[PDB]
Design a protein around this ligand. Structure first.
Ligand SMILES: [Cl-]
Ligand SMILES: [Cl-]
Ligand SMILES: [Zn+2]
Ligand SMILES: [Zn+2]
Lengths: 29, 21, 26, 21, 21, 25, 27, 27, 25, 21, 20, 20
């Protein structure tokens, strides 16, 4: 799961630059 | 749910937004 | 807001290494 | 909520975990 | 130089968007 | 110099927001 | 892919270095 | 300093690069 | 090079999970 | 060397931990 | 250099050459 | 290196005198 993971890394770098202020809930299944 | 939904393929900035509250 | 932002960045890097399946709020 | 919590000063791994459901 | 502008205030998603090529 | 390292995040946000676009440094 | 998205983010970073004053540029 | 943390995240990433085999240590 | 890059996330998760120590290189 | 080991399974947090000086 | 250097590693007489 | 190199900048002839 090396790579779900190198990724979920850069995803979250990213929801962040983006939900700006309303933010979000992150279910990893 | 979002991971099921963004790791293998790149999510841009909007999608990433529904999952916003 | 340059440097908050340099930083929210290095943050959510790090939430993720760490919550892994339960999800998160806030 | 979390920003306020981690930007001028370095956040280590466990803080980060509360915000977890 | 940009070095001199975004490195001087934050740019919204909307202002970075400004040095991109 | 900050400018030699912002130069480096800028070089990287510029690199996510700018997506594919790139940048001159 | 999410993988090379990730590698470029890396070289941008190397040239900034060798060249100096003299600079360098990245696409 | 989130700022030199953030600079060394960056030099490591740099000598990794200059010395090559010979390595270099980053210490 | 995954290895020279995971070598650099790893020199960085190693530089984040490893902090000051440095690492053998 | 390291590059050899974590770069193959994830290392839970547990396993990165092995290369630090 | 993404590809010269994302597939094998590059020297500095070599990255010298990528300035100015 | 942080002197010759984080507040000004080092060149690599100079970063080389830092290798093994
Ligand atoms: Cl990577
Ligand atoms: Cl930085
Ligand atoms: Zn990476
Ligand atoms: Zn940085």
């Amino acid at each position: 799961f090396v790579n779900q993971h190198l990724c979920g890394s850069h995803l979250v770098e990213a929801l962040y630059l983006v939900c700006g202020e309303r933010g979000f809930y992150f279910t990893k299944p | 749910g979002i991971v099921e939904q963004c790791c293998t393929s790149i999510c841009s900035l909007y999608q990433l937004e529904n999952y916003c509250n």
